[PDB]
Amino acid sequence: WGGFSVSNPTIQRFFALHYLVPFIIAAMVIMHLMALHIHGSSNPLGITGNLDRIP
């Protein structure tokens, strides 16, 4: 809170933080994609896709 209760130090740090976090999500989204790229997407049949892929 930065004080006795939710006040001026609270909302101002919350704004600073609201701006920061989205860029951490972006970096996390890149790691998500990196992990997806090593084995590729799955498919509705639940089996391998290696025998018939399209660009």
Added chain:
Amino acid sequence: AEVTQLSNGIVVATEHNPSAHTASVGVVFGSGAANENPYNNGVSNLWKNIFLSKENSAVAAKEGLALSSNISRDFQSYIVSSLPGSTDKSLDFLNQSFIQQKANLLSSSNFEATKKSVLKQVQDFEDNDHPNRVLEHLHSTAFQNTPLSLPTRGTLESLENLVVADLESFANNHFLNSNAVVVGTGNIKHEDLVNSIESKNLSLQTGTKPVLKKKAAFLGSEVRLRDDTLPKAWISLAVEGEPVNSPNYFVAKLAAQIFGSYNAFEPASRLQGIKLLDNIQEYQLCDNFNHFSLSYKDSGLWGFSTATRNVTMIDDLIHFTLKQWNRLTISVTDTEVERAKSLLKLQLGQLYESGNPVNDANLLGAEVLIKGSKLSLGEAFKKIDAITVKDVKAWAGKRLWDQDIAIAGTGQIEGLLDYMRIRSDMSMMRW
């Protein structure tokens, strides 16, 4: 360089060449695989095989004669080679096999021994001759449900179910007179042969015409014969080309010469003046390739064929090649056109004038059957030299730019991308 041809009852065509050592005579029919059906497909190949059978072949051999035959899409031909003196004994063997023995060659002991040979033959083809197997399939999908789609050697299924009655049925419908041309090449004179022919009369099924059908049409499509056990990838790709007797028969044939053919192992091949080689040689995209402008009566195929062991870069092979073809519509240079002219003449020469009369016979018969006459080699050169950059550009803008294609391949073709990817490369983005 003389194209002599006269009609009395039978249309006789000859092309004499003094110094020859030998002479060849025979008949060429205006009907081939493009006249068969999906079910009697392979009849013509069968005929060729009995005409060359051990029995019939031994008869002409005693006489000092040699046999040769070739089945194509639009035509068929039976030829007997001999010395310049026995130019008459060939005419006896020709008539003896097409009238007298048109029932002796078809015995139940000959036909069965022959059928067993074409079956091991066509089978062997499909099991090992990959490049031709692919080119054959290219015609198969490009012209599907239409005449040109039928393979010349016939299918193993229509073959093993073919009977003697079918041979006769086909023979009685296409081996007619109005659909024939007696050819004579080697050294013998036009007036020398025409006499020995107008001597023996008899028409044998005159006035009869072969059946008609539906015109051949091109269809953008593909057939993929994946086989991961083969050590290479063989692919053929093409657009609808030009038919024989087309205003652009030559522009097209010239356009193919620009990219020509290549063999990565022959040092001189690597040095050719083809821009495409700068792109494919860096990572060695293929062992070889060869362009072509195949022409037939109703249609044709313009494209190339290639074989490669670089199975992880096939998309680059196809991409670079198709980018080069884009140029024919927008940036082909004068010197590229000129380099082509020279090289086209050289190859067209070596074909129309080799030291083998049998090739001359086929070419002569085939041409006279479609356009009632043969175009002299010198007459061709005049047309070839007349081609401007503007001609190539107008042709490509009609046949190559943003046009459907046909594909076919076998072997390790996992790397050959989808149709729409290849299809998209038939053009370029612009403002």
